[PDB]
């Protein structure tokens, strides 16, 4: 139960969800940009974007804003799962081609 990995930044969070800043430690542009792309491919998301506040801190604030349908937490979970599925597909294709050649 890692409670220090991803945090909800309450000052930058709206009422009834739909807008939230998540602080993810030990992450950088690698996860940030892929997560932003996947989340932006979600039709309910109106605003996705991450910032690394300082290069001296292993930190990542990712801002998700949605319309009234779903919440930013829901969108973030969906984006993470969709990145998982993307990596599954890439793994399967790469393994198949490496086997075939």
């Amino acid at each position: 139960p890692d409670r220090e990995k991803i945090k909800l930044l309450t000052q930058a969070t709206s009422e009834d969800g739909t807008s939230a800043s998540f602080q993810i430690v030990e992450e950088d542009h690698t996860l940030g940009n892929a997560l932003r792309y996947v989340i932006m491919k979600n039709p309910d998301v109106e605003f996705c974007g991450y910032s690394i506040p300082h290069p001296s801190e292993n930190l990542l604030n990712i801002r998700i804003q949605t319309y009234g349908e779903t919440t930013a937490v829901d969108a973030l979970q969906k984006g993470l799962k969709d990145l998982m599925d993307l990596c599954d597909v890439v793994e399967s294709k790469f393994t198949e081609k490496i086997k075939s050649m």
Binding site: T95, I98, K99, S100, M101
Partner: peptide
């Protein structure tokens, strides 16, 4: 080449230290 190594081998190094 053209042979999988990840399927057979347990990726111990990919665990978080």
């Amino acid at each position: 080449v053209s042979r999988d190594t990840w399927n057979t081998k347990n990726m111990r190094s990919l665990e978080p230290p």
